[PDB]
Design an enzyme around this catalytic site. Structure first.
Site, PDB file in Angstrom:
ATOM      1  N   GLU A  69       0.806  -1.215   0.000  1.00 47.32           N
ATOM      2  CA  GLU A  69       0.000   0.000   0.000  1.00 47.32           C
ATOM      3  C   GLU A  69       0.847   1.276   0.000  1.00 47.32           C
ATOM      4  O   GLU A  69       0.532   2.244  -0.720  1.00 47.32           O
ATOM      5  CB  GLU A  69      -0.854  -0.027   1.273  1.00 47.32           C
ATOM      6  CG  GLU A  69      -1.873   1.061   1.399  1.00 47.32           C
ATOM      7  CD  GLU A  69      -2.831   0.804   2.606  1.00 47.32           C
ATOM      8  OE1 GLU A  69      -2.603  -0.191   3.376  1.00 47.32           O
ATOM      9  OE2 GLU A  69      -3.789   1.601   2.801  1.00 47.32           O
TER      10      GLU A  69
ATOM     11  N   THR B 132      -1.690   4.266   8.413  1.00 48.33           N
ATOM     12  CA  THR B 132      -1.015   5.385   7.764  1.00 48.33           C
ATOM     13  C   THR B 132       0.358   4.861   7.287  1.00 48.33           C
ATOM     14  O   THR B 132       0.962   3.986   8.011  1.00 48.33           O
ATOM     15  CB  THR B 132      -0.844   6.644   8.697  1.00 48.33           C
ATOM     16  OG1 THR B 132      -0.526   7.824   7.893  1.00 48.33           O
ATOM     17  CG2 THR B 132       0.242   6.419   9.768  1.00 48.33           C
TER      18      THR B 132
HETATM   19  N1  LIG Z   1     -12.555  15.656   6.669  1.00 48.43           N
HETATM   20  C1  LIG Z   1     -12.781  14.751   5.699  1.00 48.43           C
HETATM   21  N2  LIG Z   1     -12.497  13.463   5.926  1.00 48.43           N
HETATM   22  C2  LIG Z   1     -12.775  12.645   4.866  1.00 48.43           C
HETATM   23  C3  LIG Z   1     -13.258  13.022   3.644  1.00 48.43           C
HETATM   24  N3  LIG Z   1     -13.363  11.900   2.793  1.00 48.43           N
HETATM   25  C4  LIG Z   1     -12.960  10.903   3.527  1.00 48.43           C
HETATM   26  N4  LIG Z   1     -12.596  11.274   4.819  1.00 48.43           N
HETATM   27  C5  LIG Z   1     -12.036  10.458   5.899  1.00 48.43           C
HETATM   28  O1  LIG Z   1     -10.604  10.512   5.829  1.00 48.43           O
HETATM   29  C6  LIG Z   1     -10.011   9.269   6.231  1.00 48.43           C
HETATM   30  C7  LIG Z   1      -9.255   8.806   4.989  1.00 48.43           C
HETATM   31  O2  LIG Z   1     -10.138   8.435   3.911  1.00 48.43           O
HETATM   32  P1  LIG Z   1      -9.624   7.347   2.905  1.00 48.43           P
HETATM   33  O3  LIG Z   1      -8.276   7.789   2.482  1.00 48.43           O
HETATM   34  O4  LIG Z   1     -10.649   7.214   1.847  1.00 48.43           O
HETATM   35  O5  LIG Z   1      -9.488   6.037   3.751  1.00 48.43           O
HETATM   36  P2  LIG Z   1      -9.496   4.534   3.373  1.00 48.43           P
HETATM   37  O6  LIG Z   1      -8.791   4.286   2.020  1.00 48.43           O
HETATM   38  O7  LIG Z   1     -10.973   4.116   3.353  1.00 48.43           O
HETATM   39  N5  LIG Z   1      -8.739   3.717   4.556  1.00 48.43           N
HETATM   40  P3  LIG Z   1      -7.528   2.649   4.536  1.00 48.43           P
HETATM   41  O8  LIG Z   1      -6.537   3.178   3.453  1.00 48.43           O
HETATM   42  O9  LIG Z   1      -6.846   2.816   5.894  1.00 48.43           O
HETATM   43  O10 LIG Z   1      -7.994   1.173   4.370  1.00 48.43           O
HETATM   44  C8  LIG Z   1     -11.206   8.384   6.675  1.00 48.43           C
HETATM   45  O11 LIG Z   1     -11.401   8.423   8.122  1.00 48.43           O
HETATM   46  C9  LIG Z   1     -12.343   8.971   5.829  1.00 48.43           C
HETATM   47  O12 LIG Z   1     -13.610   8.825   6.390  1.00 48.43           O
HETATM   48  C10 LIG Z   1     -13.541  14.413   3.446  1.00 48.43           C
HETATM   49  O13 LIG Z   1     -14.002  14.960   2.457  1.00 48.43           O
HETATM   50  N6  LIG Z   1     -13.303  15.239   4.529  1.00 48.43           N
HETATM   51 MG   LIG Z   2      -6.818   4.010   1.707  1.00 44.28          MG
END
Ligand SMILES: Nc1nc2c(ncn2[C@@H]2O[C@H](COP(=O)(O)OP(=O)(O)NP(=O)(O)O)[C@@H](O)[C@H]2O)c(=O)[nH]1
Ligand SMILES: [Mg+2]
Length: 419
Positions: free
Chosen positions: A130, A172
């Site tokens: 990742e 992360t």
């Molecule tokens: N403030 C904010 N947070 C957001 C937004 N879109 C997504 N998030 C949040 O930011 C974090 C990162 O989102 P994302 O990168 O899509 O995470 P992921 O790919 O689902 N997680 P992982 O990579 O750990 O499996 C999550 O807690 C998600 O809910 C946004 O527009 N604003």
């Molecule tokens: Mg992700």
């Protein structure tokens, strides 16, 4: 020219997104040639949120796939590879229940295999995968693997690469090119791209994703304070303890408790500092939690929640974040807003709003105390989520790898003229 397509589902902890990429059929080996054609965001949670109902995980994908049938021209359906890769949400569920995990992969697999694409598998990526695939994405899009110069006069030092920092929902990642000796094989990465060797460091901190850090802060706040110093004064909620304690990330800390915010920047700073164990280092030097890490060097792009949080601080709060000191002031100012203050600065939807003070504080500490950025190295970090029209993430680099589209060497080795 004739165009080719490929499709990646990024099945993350908090969401699934579908990306369709496209590239010229006869100039497909060029770096920077592949780019994003279209994308679709699946409604509701990530596939792991259906652990108790795995057929809903498959069915959740259907609308985006129908959009893929419209996005890729019909004549190319059968020759378009489709891949799903899953991250820390599925990694954490695999700790909890390898069986539920396998049932969710099976449901998404069964949904996918009945579309007309060349479906190539649903897999769980390792943390190294990742981190590295995100670094490949960024550097490929920005053409950092081109060998700049001309015969008899190559630029030296060779073109620098851009480091990658991904703040997901459940883990992360940090990944960068380093000249330091490697002292832990689980962090060591050697790439051969276009005739060149890149020596790269990578690490994924599971449970240091945004939603998992908020859950640990909530657990920790309940244990030490019975109020939440990161939460704005006047905000409160009914907290369901089962949800707090069921995550593999928190369960190492009766049914419903009321919890309120106190807008306490200093106590919030102290709660967050407990996340980082800097107490010992079995290596010549560490980031935190005993993890080997060489000195950060070179430019970095900080995307996903790094970007979302910084965008709030700059766009909504109106505050600069150009130095670590500015980032820290922005965080204090934010944390010191009452709930009524904070809500008055956001006239639209409030989901996530109570959480910015905690996430900004985590980000400032992660970069400064955890990764050891200082004012000089922080100057070289930028916050962005897009390069050349394509969203920055691991999906593109995953696609490039599995479709075998970045060659280890140029064809005929460019007549040895790069030796
Ligand atoms: N403030 C904010 N947070 C957001 C937004 N879109 C997504 N998030 C949040 O930011 C974090 C990162 O989102 P994302 O990168 O899509 O995470 P992921 O790919 O689902 N997680 P992982 O990579 O750990 O499996 C999550 O807690 C998600 O809910 C946004 O527009 N604003
Ligand atoms: Mg992700």
């Amino acid at each position: 020219p004739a165009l080719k397509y490929g499709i990646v589902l990024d099945a993350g902890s908090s969401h699934t997104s579908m990306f369709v990429y496209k590239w010229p059929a006869d100039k497909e080996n060029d770096t920077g040639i592949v780019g994003q054609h279209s994308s679709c965001d699946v409604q509701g949670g990530g596939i792991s949120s259906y652990a108790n109902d795995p057929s809903k995980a498959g069915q959740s994908l259907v609308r985006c796939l129908e959009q893929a049938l419209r996005d890729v021209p019909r004549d190319r359906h059968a020759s378009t590879p489709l891949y799903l890769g899953a991250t820390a949400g599925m990694r954490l569920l695999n700790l909890t229940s390898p069986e539920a995990t396998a049932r969710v992969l099976e449901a998404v697999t069964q949904t996918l295999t009945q579309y007309p694409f060349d479906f190539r598998g649903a897999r769980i990526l390792s943390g190294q995968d990742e981190g590295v695939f995100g670094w490949v994405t960024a550097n490929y899009l920005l053409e950092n693997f081109i060998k700049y110069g001309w015969v008899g006069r190559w630029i030296r030092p060779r073109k620098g690469t851009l480091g990658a920092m991904d703040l997901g929902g459940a883990s992360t990642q940090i990944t960068f090119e380093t000249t330091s000796p490697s002292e832990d094989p689980g962090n060591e990465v050697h790439l051969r791209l276009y005739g060149q060797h890149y020596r790269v460091y990578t690490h994924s901190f599971l449970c240091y994703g945004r939603d998992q850090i908020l859950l640990r802060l909530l657990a920790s706040a309940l244990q030490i304070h019975r109020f939440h110093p990161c939460w704005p004064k006047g905000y409160s909620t009914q907290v369901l303890l089962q949800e707090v304690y069921q995550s593999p990330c928190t369960m190492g800390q009766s049914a419903i408790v009321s919890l309120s915010g106190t807008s306490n920047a200093t106590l919030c700073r102290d709660l967050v500092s407990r996340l980082f164990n800097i107490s010992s280092c079995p290596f010549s030097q560490c980031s935190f939690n005993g993890v080997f890490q060489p000195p950060v060097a070179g430019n970095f792009i900080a995307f996903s929640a790094f970007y979302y949080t910084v965008d709030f601080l700059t766009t909504v709060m109106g505050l600069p974040v150009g130095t670590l000191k500015q980032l820290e002031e922005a965080t204090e100012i934010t944390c010191n807003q009452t709930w009524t203050e904070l809500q008055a600065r956001v006239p639209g939807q409030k989901t996530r709003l109570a959480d910015y003070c905690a996430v900004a504080m985590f980000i400032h500490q992660l970069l400064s105390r955890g990764y050891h950025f200082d004012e000089r190295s922080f100057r070289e970090v930028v916050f962005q989520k897009k390069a050349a029209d394509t969203a920055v993430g691991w999906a593109l680099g995953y696609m490039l790898n599995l479709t075998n589209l970045i060659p280890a060497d140029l064809p005929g080795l460019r007549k040895g003229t790069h030796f």
